[PDB]
Subunit: 232 residues, 4 copies
C-alpha cells in the first residue's frame, strides 16, 4: 500500500468515515481520516487557490484555501514528515466524484522543494499541454482544450461525471528529505475550479505526496479521493 | 524605538539579562530576552549556516544553524509576526562585540519574501561588493577585499575588535504582510564565519526584521547585539 | 544627464524625432531614437505582456510584447550594456501622455537580475499597494484602488489625462555588472493596460534601466517618454 | 537517431573530425562538429563553472566557462532551437574518455526553463545522492561517496579510466517550446572537476538537450562525447 501525505479539499462530508459535518480542508497523514480539519466555506463556480507549505525544522504542514476577496480557510498539523514519507516521493493532485460530482479542474499548479544538507526542485504550470510529458496522469485525469488539468471525467458540455477518479503526478521524483539534511522544505500552490449541479458537490481535490510508485488504489473512489484503499 | 524580530546567534552568555548558560540560537520578539532558545554548540573558526523561515499560516518562526557534518541546532517559536512588525519592514543582519570579540563575517546572505493576497522579493549575496548600494551598512559594518561582509570591526591582520556594532540592511523595504494577504512568508539564509582569540567569543550575529527606518539603538552594544536599547 | 537603456512601448509615432510610421516596440540605448524597432500592432483596451531579457555573454537585449492569442512582436539589439550603464543601476517603468493620451496601467511587474563572478535580485508585483515602499514613484505615477500601478494621470472616471509623465523605480539598486563578473543577466516582465479614447493613443510605456539617481528629466514629456531631456 | 543540442567542454582536440587545434568550448547542433567554438584554456585539477543560456526571442545559445579568478571563455551561436529540438526534451550532462582520460566530475548542476504563452522547471543539485531518483544515469555515470556526479569511470584511488561514457539526464522531460509560446528560455549551470594524469586529458563534458528518449548512441565513445553515433 502507498504512503500518503495529503492536503484534501473535501467538498463532500462523509461523517461515517470521520469527516466533520461540512466541506473542509484537511491534512491527511496515511489515512483519509484527517489529523486536522478546518471548515471549508465552498464557493462552487469560483476559482479557488490553495497554498501548502512545510519545512522540517518547524514541522508544521499548513494549507490555506481562498477565493478572491473571501475569508481564507487555513489548517495546520504538527508533523515530522520524515517519519511518514520515504526519502524520495512524487507529488501530485488527486480528485474524485462518486454518487455526487463536481468538476475537478486544476488551472495552475506549482511546487518548490528544497533540501539543505542546497538542492531544489521547482515546477509551475499555468497552462497544461495536451500531452503533459512531465505529468503522470492517472485514471480519468486529462488536460482539456483550455489547457486545464481535469482530474475527473467531464463531458463535452463540461458537466462533471460521477464515480470518477484521477490524478496528475509531477514526473520527477522529489527528494524531500535525506539523512544529512539540515532542512527540507516544500511549498505547493494550485488553483482549482469546482463547478457542480448537485447541491452537494463531491468528492474533492487533494495535493498529495506519496511513494514514487504511487498508483490509484483499488477502491479509492469517491470519499477516499483516489488516495487510500480504505477509510481506516 | 524600533520594532525588532530577530534570530540571534549569541556566542556570549549574558545570564544577567536572560541568557541561558551557554551560546545559543534565539528567537527574539521585541526583546533581547529570547522567547525561545536552543543550545548552540559553537564551532569558532568554521563557516556556519543559518536557515530562517516563517509563514503566516503556520505562524512558526524557525531557525536552524549548522556547520558542515555537524549536528544542527534548531529553535522555534509560534508567533504571528503581523502582531509584531509593521506591514513594511527592512531585513538585516547585526553583530556586536563588547569586552569580548569575534569576527562577525557574513559570507553569504539570501532572503525570499512572498505575499499572496503573488508578490515577491528575493535577494541573495555570495559576494559583497566594496560599495554595496543595495545594502544599508550601519555602524562598523563594512565589506572587505575578500568580498566578505564584516559586521564588526576587524583589524588589518584580521583580528576582531571589541565594543563594535554593525549591521547591513537590504536596501529595499519588504512588504511582509498586508490586510488582504492570504499568506505572507519569508525565508532567509546566511553563512557566517566567527573567529576569535578569546576563549569566550562575543557577542553574536542576528538576522533581523525591523521597521524600515530601523537604526542602531544607542546602547545596543555587546550583549544587546545592535538590536535593542535595553535588556528589558 | 541620466544614462538610459530602455525598452519602449511607443504607442505614438513621432517620425520627426526618429520614430517609424507606426506604434512600435523599441530598444533605446541612451537616446529616444531606437537602435532597433519592430512594428507594434497595438490592441488598445486589452492587457499586454512584455518580456525583456539580456545576458552579458550573448549581449543581446531582446523584448517581446503580446496580448492573449495574438501575434507577438519581438525586437532585438546586440549591445554590451556594460559599455552603456554604470555598475549599479535602478530599474523602472516609465510612461507619458502628451497632446494625446492613454492609460498607462501596469498590472504586474517582475525583474530578475543575476551576477556570477551567484548574486541575485528578484522582485515581482501582481498587486501594487497603496503605499509602495519598495517603489520610487516619480511624477504622476500612483497606485490605484485596484492595486494597479498607473504611471500617468487618470481621472476618477478613469479617463487618461494628457501631458502626464510618471515612473516607478524599484527601490533597491541593482548590480547589473561588475569587474569580476563572468556573466550578468536580467529578465523583466510587466503586463500593461493601455486604454484610450484618442484614435491615436500616446505616448507609451517603457521598462528602463538607469543610473541609480535617475529622475524625470525636464522636458522628457510625451514622445520622450519620461526618459530623455531631448530627442537627440 | 537522437536530436542533440549540446554545449561541449572538449578537452581533447580531434582535428580529424572538425575540432580546432586545442581544447575548446563548443555549441553543437545535431553534430559533434561545432557550429561555434572558442578556445578553452583548460585548468585541469581546478573546479570549473559553465553557464549556458538561451531564449527563443534572442535565439542566441551562449555558454561561458571559467575557473575562479581566471579569464572566462564564452561561445555563442545564433540558432532558433525550435527548428532543431522536439517540443519536449530531456536535459542532461555527458562525458567521455577514450585513449586518453580525465575525471568527469560534476559537483553541481542546475537548470531553469520557462515557457510563456508562465510555465517553469527549475532544478539544482549541489549534492548528488547515492541513488538519484530524479536522475537518469546512463552508461558509466554514477554518484560517489562525496556526493559528486561522476560521468565516467573513476577507480577507487580516483584515477579516471579510458574508454568510458556516461550521462545523467534530469528525470522530468522539459517542455522547451510550444506552438503558442511567446518566449521559451532555459539557463543551465554546472560546475565540474576535470583531473587527469595524461598530458592530454580526454575527452570532455557536455550539457545537452535531446529528445526525451535519448540514449547513449552506439559508437558515441571518446571524441563523440556520448552524444552522436558518428562524426558527421
Ligand atoms: O459523491 C459522494 C459519495 O457518494 C457515494 O456515497 C454516497 C453518499 N451519499 C449516498 C447516498 C446513497 C448511496 Br447507495 C451512496 Cl453510495 C451515497 C460514494 O461514492 C462516496 O464515496 C462518496 O463520498
Ligand atoms: O563581549 C561580552 C560582554 O562584555 C561586556 O560585559 C562583560 C562580560 N564580561 C565582563 C566582565 C567585566 C566587565 Br566591567 C564587563 Cl562590562 C563584562 C559587555 O559589553 C557586554 O554587553 C557583553 O555581552
Ligand atoms: O501625445 C502625442 C504627442 O503630442 C505632442 O506633439 C503633438 C503630436 N501631434 C501634434 C499636433 C499639434 C501640436 Br501643437 C502638437 Cl505639440 C502635437 C507632444 O506632447 C509630443 O511629445 C507627443 O508625442
Ligand atoms: O581520448 C582521446 C581519443 O582517443 C581515441 O583516439 C585517439 C587519439 N589519439 C590516438 C592515437 C592512436 C590511436 Br589507435 C587512437 Cl584510437 C587515438 C579515441 O577514443 C577518440 O575518440 C578520442 O577522442
Ligand atoms: Ca469526504
Ligand atoms: Ca548574549
Ligand atoms: Ca513616440
Ligand atoms: Ca574532441
Ligand atoms: Cl446521500
Ligand atoms: Cl567577564
Ligand atoms: Cl498631431
Ligand atoms: Cl594520439
Ligand atoms: Mn474528509
Ligand atoms: Mn541571548
Ligand atoms: Mn519611438
Ligand atoms: Mn570538439
Amino acid at each position: 500500500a502507498d504512503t500518503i501525505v495529503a492536503v484534501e479539499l473535501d467538498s463532500y462530508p462523509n461523517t461515517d468515515i470521520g469527516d466533520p459535518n461540512y466541506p473542509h480542508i484537511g491534512i491527511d497523514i496515511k489515512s483519509i481520516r484527517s489529523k486536522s480539519t478546518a471548515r471549508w466555506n465552498m464557493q462552487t463556480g469560483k476559482v479557488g487557490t490553495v497554498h501548502i507549505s512545510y519545512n522540517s525544522v518547524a514541522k508544521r504542514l499548513s494549507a490555506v484555501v481562498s477565493y478572491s476577496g473571501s475569508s481564507s480557510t487555513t489548517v495546520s498539523y504538527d508533523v515530522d514528515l520524515n517519519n511518514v514519507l520515504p526519502e524520495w516521493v512524487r507529488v501530485g493532485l488527486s480528485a474524485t466524484t462518486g454518487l455526487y460530482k463536481e468538476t475537478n479542474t486544476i488551472l495552475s499548479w506549482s511546487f518548490t522543494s528544497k533540501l539543505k544538507t542546497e538542492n531544489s526542485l521547482h515546477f509551475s504550470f499555468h497552462k497544461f499541454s495536451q500531452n503533459p510529458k512531465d505529468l503522470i496522469l492517472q485514471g480519468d485525469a486529462f488536460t482539456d482544450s483550455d489547457g486545464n488539468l481535469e482530474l475527473t471525467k467531464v463531458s463535452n458540455s463540461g458537466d462533471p461525471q460521477g464515480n470518477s477518479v484521477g490524478r496528475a503526478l509531477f514526473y520527477a521524483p522529489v527528494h524531500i528529505w535525506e539523512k544529512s539534511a539540515v532542512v527540507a522544505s516544500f511549498d505547493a500552490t494550485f488553483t482549482f475550479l469546482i463547478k457542480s449541479p448537485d447541491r452537494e458537490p463531491a468528492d474533492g481535490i487533494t495535493f498529495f505526496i506519496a511513494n514514487t510508485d504511487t498508483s490509484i488504489p483499488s477502491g479509492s473512489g469517491g470519499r477516499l479521493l483516489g488516495l487510500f484503499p480504505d477509510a481506516n
